[PDB]
Design a protein around this ligand. Structure first.
Ligand SMILES: CCCCCCCCCCCCCCCCCC(=O)OC[C@H](COP(=O)([O-])OCC(O)COP(=O)([O-])OC[C@@H](COC(=O)CCCCCCCCCCCCCCCCC)OC(=O)CCCCCCCCCCCCCCCCC)OC(=O)CCCCCCCCCCCCCCCCC
Ligand SMILES: CCCCCCCCCCCCCCCCCC(=O)OC[C@H](COP(=O)([O-])OCC[N+](C)(C)C)OC(=O)CCCCCCCCCCCCCCCCC
Ligand SMILES: CCCCCCCCCCCCCCCCCC(=O)OC[C@H](COP(=O)([O-])OCC[N+](C)(C)C)OC(=O)CCCCCCCCCCCCCCCCC
Ligand SMILES: CCCCCCCCCCCCCCCCCCCC(=O)O[C@H](COC(=O)CCCCCCCCCCCCCC)COP(=O)(O)OCCN
Ligand SMILES: CCCCCCCCCCCCCCCCCCCC(=O)O[C@H](COC(=O)CCCCCCCCCCCCCC)COP(=O)(O)OCCN
Ligand code: HEC
Ligand code: HEM
Ligand code: HEM
Ligand SMILES: CCCCCC[C@H]1C(=O)O[C@H](C)[C@H](NC(=O)c2cccc(NC=O)c2O)C(=O)O[C@@H](C)[C@@H]1OC(=O)CC(C)C
Ligand SMILES: CCCCCCCCCCCCO[C@@H]1O[C@H](CO)[C@@H](O[C@H]2O[C@H](CO)[C@@H](O)[C@H](O)[C@H]2O)[C@H](O)[C@H]1O
Lengths: 85, 124, 56, 244, 71, 383, 54, 55
């Protein structure tokens, strides 16, 4: 499924020309300011929901559970604790 | 899963008017959110290929289609490592997202599944 | 230009320099665990009075 | 659990040693040793600290040897194989008030005063817990608390009833440096001292961490330049495809 | 004379006055309840620990930094 | 022919660390593998050093650890480095497993590296559990007592097995000496399995974040991933430094600085943070045997991901529903962790049960359903 | 600047020698610099600051 | 306060002397070795012990 250099197991390639420049000829940090701001904003905005939804839900769950637990072990919560056990 | 399974189930859905009415719009949105077109892939480029069946289907691709697939994979890999998306002509338009591989893999699998059936035949 | 290459080797060399300074520090500090510990260094160097000791 | 069962959580006090770049105040450490010696040592041991550990922290070598030489420790037997005592040396450990646990408990209405060498690390809260506990005995236990006999009410101690009575009162110690020995001052000093006892490397550890932070930060910055430099051919790569 | 004594008193009369009142009210109730007969043969004996903790926790939050500043 | 290729020994190093062909687009989550290698090296270096100063006898163990802290030059560092790196090892291992689940690294053709990895994960848990006992503080003792009494639930032979592991009728000196020997050994076994899962991976090579073949576009492991790995090494060492030098006890439990006392039971026996999710799973089942089976099943169930993931596409980069499901799975795994350290009280008892059902239902119900539906949506949606 | 490159960088033996000599100097000077800095930010706190009383 | 108890089967057979110094003082400076391993700790074993005691 993977070969080695010389016979890596790619379908035959033809018609792609690849170009690059030397690391010594390039600015390694070209457009870094633009990328750090605009590119990171784009990539974060695109993935935000997949983090925010589960985190916000499980934080809310925990918050409700920890607040109930705290309340059950107060004087006010004596009766509700007695029923819960 | 087998591509055969996926294709058969999809056909059941597309037949039922009710089902298609509710599923086809969902599936179109899903594909828009999936975002593989923004890397210039066609859907079929994403199918797992490290399987004997899929290796055989890829070998059956017409040379042109095969060379184009290699370009799309290399292009997408470069966008991935650059953390850039496709722009302009590199973005796969909905009309260009053709199932170029599905016919080949369905034939490979049809034979493989026939072979399994026939290996279990009982003379009556 | 030579200036151009030299700059990038200054970065590589700085990184080699801090890695060498850091490795020396790491090795020397870490292996010093194997030198006599504080209790041993105090079990040695025993001190004795001489006022108690009579002639002969 | 009820908050009583947990114990009140101690306030966060601004200790001199809090702060990535801050050492202990060694004048406070010395004052704290004097509190330990005159108050706590009556009931609590400090078994993991040797006289040599005070040297160049709180005391000069001469002062520490003087402290050791005032005590008697078990020597190797004499020539007839009879047991013998010797004066203490710097390598000796600070001796406990009790020979064993049973003696300790008998003197303390059943409760066993723990060794204080690690107490600052062995309780949630650290110095803050020690400070809070020693200063946190109310004049009157909250109405309705039933203390067991020989227990004292202290909210910071889990359960509320601690076998250790309030011990710090204004002027139980006379500090040698003229600092007013108020309850709070003595608790602050002794809590600093015990924190040092639990973590005596603290000062050295944080200085080496400053060096480590600086070097590792620089190497992180450089490693990112080098990575970007070596990867730029791959990031910058461009393709031209001509379908065959 | 112990700096903490005055700082705690000031914090009780000032920023933690609401908590001081709660603890006070509680103690009044509990003492009165203990005064009444057949208290020893009651099911639930009320304490004032909760209110005490709320007060102490408040006082400590308003005092911690001030106290260490005068040592 | 170049020596690195000609010579058999050099060629093996070459094939793994230098000419190894990697995908060109691995992102930073592919760096946890090398961080786990770094953790394993730091644990061997610090561990072997602690063993030169540690005494395995129960009358002296705790004292030997105090000797390390107080008397040995840099002993504080070696001890805290070893203790904290055990936490970092689990952060990196959870990250590495998370990366593998999100990007479908467990699918064909990489079932074998994944399956060996699940065993590495079990060995790491055993290794870190035994190491925790060696201090012989209160958490050491009470940890060994409760954890080894779970084995008592094995029917018929359970009690006998416990006594056999302890070497006695309670946790004591025999237990401590044998855990020392095994804790020394287990990291070497773990290193061998780590090497086996790499050899297994070598047949397919690394997966990549797009989940497509990389056979078309490969990059040598050196210099590209060598230099990429240095960035995370230095990032890791910055985190390491903050804990080891500035807050060495933040991740730990103070109860382990009290010497073990078989009489006094600590307020709360909670494991090290990284074991907490499995502890929550165990508490969720009321039955003793049920609980133990569930706890082991929570790890072994990872072995069925290759079966239950029915997707025709490898990984979640392109699967919005799978990404949401995975987000919920990961957050639930953290909530289980938190529920492992609360007291067994309402309302956390019921909550723990719900989270435990969610944990298992991901593998057994949701992932098979969601992956089947997404298959159909990709096909219909691209027609 | 060509001269600098030619002398210290061109030959790897020279470059590694330069790196190690630099490492030696950095190590020694950084030690001294941190020592002084640490003493200033922790002034009157350390044993060396109170030792004079004894 | 310290206490004594009667011996049990798990107790070790007690020695005649509390320490080496007591042992040597009673034996004109010589220290009688422990005999638990003496048969393995001398070339000859039983034969050496037999020969010595009778020789
Ligand atoms: C611990 C030991 C210390 C060592 C450090 C190693 C950690 C490095 C790592 O693996 O994560 C960095 C990693 C950056 O790695 P990368 O190679 O640039 O892209 C990897 C993603 O696949 C690329 O993801 P993407 O391209 O979709 O970018 C997503 C990311 C944006 O990524 C950025 O870096 C910006 O933003 C988020 O997902 C943030 C969520 C919103 C919160 C508000 O950070 C993330 O992207 C974290 C996302 C996790 C959620
Ligand atoms: C950890 C140990 C670090 C050792 C530092 C000693 C000098 C080596 C170094 O930093 O790399 C420079 C050298 C070479 O870096 P280089 O390969 O970029 O330099 C070659 C090009 N010239 C010589 C023209 C500059 O690294 C090595 O030779 C390998 C040693 C790795 C360390
Ligand atoms: C906290 C919850 C995490 C949910 C992640 C959802 C995806 C996301 O937004 O991540 C950003 C990125 C998204 O990356 P991506 O590769 O999907 O997309 C890159 C961008 N495109 C689409 C253009 C190709 O995801 C990751 O990198 C996820 C790695 C998972 C690590 C999880 C560790 C948890 C440990 C638990 C062990 C059991
Ligand atoms: C094994 C554990 C690995 C973790 C390393 C972290 C730091 C350990 C070193 C101790 C330390 O704090 O060093 C400081 C400087 O930081 C530094 O300069 C060290 C940080 C450098 C990090 C990476 C460098 C190499 C690490 C591993 C390489 C191993 C190979 C050789 C041992 C103090 O400095 P000092 O005054 O104590 O120094 C003595 C010479 N003046
Ligand atoms: C840990 C401490 C790291 C410190 C050592 C790093 C090298 C220091 C500088 C030397 C350097 O940059 O030169 C290269 C050496 O790097 C190398 O040859 C190695 C490159 C990166 C070093 C380590 C690779 C990490 C990968 C996996 C991490 C594993 C962690 C598990 C323990 C050779 O430059 P060049 O060879 O590119 O060519 C260029 C022409 N000769
Ligand atoms: C005459 C007795 C006595 C004196 C004086 C004394 N203690 Fe204690 N201390 C105890 C006893 C008994 C306990 C254990 C109480 C218990 O477990 O109920 C104890 C417990 C403690 C604890 C730990 C509480 C815990 O969380 O387990 C600390 C810390 C402590 N003492 C520090 C001090 C310091 C500091 C001083 C004086 C500066 C001091 N003690 C003075 C008898 C004393
Ligand atoms: C995966 C590798 C390892 C892990 C995850 C690991 C984990 C641990 C942990 C969690 C502890 C408890 C630490 C504490 O709180 O003090 C510990 C202690 C110990 N480990 Fe390891 N360990 C590893 C490898 C080793 C190795 C190879 C040795 C070689 C002997 C070793 C020797 C010790 C010793 C002697 C202790 C007790 C001293 C102490 O607690 O610091 N460890 N280990
Ligand atoms: C000591 C612990 C481990 C070490 C040192 C280790 C090391 C590595 C390394 C170096 C790689 C290749 C680079 C990378 O992808 O990050 C890798 C890949 C992998 N590891 Fe681990 N690993 C460890 C534990 C695990 C565990 C616990 C699992 C699974 C439960 C696992 C499963 C895998 C898989 C499936 C891959 C292939 C992923 C891919 O490239 O797509 N490993 N590991
Ligand atoms: C010296 C030759 C002996 C062969 C084994 C030695 C180690 C070895 O192969 O090193 C490599 C540097 C390797 N990295 C990777 O595979 C890797 C691959 C792709 C991308 C990245 N990262 C992305 O940017 C990688 O990090 C690694 O860290 O794996 C260790 C665990 C290996 O240790 C062992 O198994 C033996 C034992 C010490 C555990
Ligand atoms: C592959 C390895 C090859 C063999 C190399 C052999 C290295 C072993 C050398 C151990 C040398 C230790 O020598 C000793 O180091 C310690 C630090 O560790 C230095 O100690 C100095 O810094 C440390 C912190 O780093 C402070 O605690 C201390 O107050 C200060 O004096 C000593 O000034 C030096 O006397």
């Amino acid at each position: 499924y993977m070969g080695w250099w010389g016979h890596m197991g790619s379908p035959p390639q033809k018609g792609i020309a690849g170009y690059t420049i030397s690391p010594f000829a390039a600015r390694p940090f070209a457009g870094v300011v633009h990328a750090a701001i605009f590119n990171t904003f784009r990539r974060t905005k695109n993935q935000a929901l997949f983090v925010i939804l589960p985190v916000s839900f499980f934080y809310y769950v925990w918050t409700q559970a920890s607040e109930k637990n705290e309340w059950l072990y107060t004087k006010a919560g004596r009766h509700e604790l007695a029923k819960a056990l | 899963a087998s591509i055969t399974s996926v294709v058969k189930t999809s056909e059941l859905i597309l037949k039922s008017p009710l089902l298609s009415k509710i599923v086809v719009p969902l599936a179109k949105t899903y594909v828009k959110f999936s975002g593989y077109r923004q890397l210039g892939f066609k859907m079929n480029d994403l199918i797992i290929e490290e399987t004997p069946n899929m290796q055989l289907a890829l070998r059956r691709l017409p040379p042109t289609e095969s060379y184009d697939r290699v370009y799309r994979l290399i292009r997408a890999t470069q966008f991935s490592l650059s953390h850039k998306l496709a722009t302009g002509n590199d973005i796969t338009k909905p009309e260009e997202d053709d199932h170029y591989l599905i016919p080949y893999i369905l034939d490979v699998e049809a034979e493989a599944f026939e072979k399994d059936a026939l290996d279990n035949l009982e003379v009556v | 230009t030579d200036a151009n290459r030299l700059f990038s080797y200054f970065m590589i060399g700085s990184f080699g320099m801090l890695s060498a300074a850091g490795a020396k520090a790491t090795v020397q500090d870490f292996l010093s665990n194997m030198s006599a510990s504080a209790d041993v260094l105090a079990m040695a160097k025993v001190e004795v009075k001489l006022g108690a000791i009579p002639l002969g | 659990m009820t908050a009583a069962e947990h114990g009140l959580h101690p306030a966060e006090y601004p200790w001199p040693q809090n702060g990535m770049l801050s050492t202990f105040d060694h004048a406070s450490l010395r004052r704290g040793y004097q509190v330990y010696k005159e108050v706590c040592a009556a009931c609590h041991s400090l078994d993991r600290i040797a006289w040599r550990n005070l040297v160049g922290v709180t005391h000069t070598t001469d002062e520490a040897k003087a402290f050791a030489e005032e005590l008697e420790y078990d020597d190797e037997p004499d020539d007839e194989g009879n047991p013998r005592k010797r004066p203490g040396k710097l390598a000796d450990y600070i001796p406990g008030p009790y020979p064993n646990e049973q003696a300790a408990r008998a003197a303390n209405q059943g409760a066993l005063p723990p060794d204080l060498s690690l107490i600052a690390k062995a309780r949630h809260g650290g110095a803050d817990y020690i400070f809070a506990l020693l200063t946190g005995y109310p004049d009157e236990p909250p109405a309705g608390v039933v203390l067991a006999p020989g227990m004292n009410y202290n909210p910071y101690f889990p359960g509320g009833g601690i076998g250790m009575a309030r011990t710090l009162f204004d002027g139980v110690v006379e500090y040698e440096d003229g600092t007013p020995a108020t309850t709070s001052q003595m608790a602050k000093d002794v809590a600093a001292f015990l924190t040092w006892a639990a973590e005596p490397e603290h000062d050295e550890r944080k200085k080496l961490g400053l060096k480590a932070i600086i070097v590792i930060s620089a190497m992180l910055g450089l490693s990112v330049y080098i990575k970007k430099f070596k990867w730029s051919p791959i990031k910058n790569r461009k393709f031209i495809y001509n379908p065959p | 004379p112990d700096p903490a004594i005055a700082l705690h008193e000031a914090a009780a009369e000032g920023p933690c006055h609401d908590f001081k009142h709660h603890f006070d009210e509680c103690v009044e109730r509990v003492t009165k309840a203990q005064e009444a007969e057949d208290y020893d043969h009651a099911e639930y004996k009320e304490d004032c620990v909760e209110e005490f903790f709320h007060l102490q926790h408040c006082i400590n939050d308003n005092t911690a930094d001030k106290l260490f500043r005068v040592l | 022919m170049a020596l690195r290729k000609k010579n058999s020994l050099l060629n093996m190093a070459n094939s793994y660390v230098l000419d190894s062909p990697q995908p060109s687009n691995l992102n930073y989550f592919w760096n946890f593998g090398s961080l786990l290698a770094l953790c394993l090296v730091i644990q061997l270096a610090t561990g072997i050093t602690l063993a030169m100063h540690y005494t395995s006898h129960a009358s002296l163990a705790f004292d030997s650890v105090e000797h390390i802290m107080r008397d040995v030059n840099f002993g504080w560092f070696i001890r805290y480095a070893h203790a904290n790196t055990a936490s970092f090892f689990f952060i990196c291992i959870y990250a590495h497993m998370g990366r593998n689940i999100y990007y479908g690294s467990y699918k064909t053709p990489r079932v074998l590296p994944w399956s060996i990895g699940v065993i590495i994960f079990l060995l790491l848990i055993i290794t870190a559990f035994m190491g925790y006992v060696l201090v012989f503080g209160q958490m050491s003792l009470w940890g060994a007592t409760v954890i080894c009494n779970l084995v008592s639930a094995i029917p018929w032979l359970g009690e006998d097995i416990v006594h056999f592991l302890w070497g006695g009728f309670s946790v004591g000196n025999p237990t401590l000496q044998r855990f020392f020997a095994l804790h020394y050994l287990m990291p070497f076994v773990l290193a061998v399995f780590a090497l086996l899962h790499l050899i297994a991976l070598h047949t397919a090579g690394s997966s990549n974040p797009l989940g497509i073949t990389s056979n078309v576009d490969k990059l040598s492991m050196h210099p590209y991933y060598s230099f990429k790995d240095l960035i995370t090494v230095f990032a890791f060492l910055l985190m390491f430094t903050l804990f080891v030098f500035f807050s060495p006890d933040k991740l730990g439990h103070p109860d382990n600085y009290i010497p073990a006392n078989p009489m006094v039971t600590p307020a709360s026996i909670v494991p090290e943070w990284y074991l907490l999710p499995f502890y929550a799973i165990l508490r969720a089942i009321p039955d003793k045997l049920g609980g133990v089976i569930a706890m082991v099943a929570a790890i072994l169930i990872l072995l069925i991901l290759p079966i239950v993931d029915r997707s025709i596409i490898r990984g979640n980069a392109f699967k919005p529903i799978s990404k949401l499901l995975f987000g919920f799975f990961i957050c639930n795994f953290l909530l289980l962790g938190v529920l492992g350290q609360v007291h067994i009280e309402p309302p956390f008892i019921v909550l723990g049960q719900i989270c435990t059902i969610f944990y298992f239902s991901y593998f057994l119900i949701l992932l098979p359903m969601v992956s089947t539906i997404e298959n159909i949506f990709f096909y219909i949606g691209s027609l | 600047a060509t001269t600098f490159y030619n002398v210290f960088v061109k030959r790897n033996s020279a470059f590694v020698a330069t790196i190690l000599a630099s490492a030696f100097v950095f190590d020694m000077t950084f030690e001294t610099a941190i020592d002084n800095f640490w003493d200033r930010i922790n002034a009157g706190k350390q044993w060396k600051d109170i030792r004079h009383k004894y």
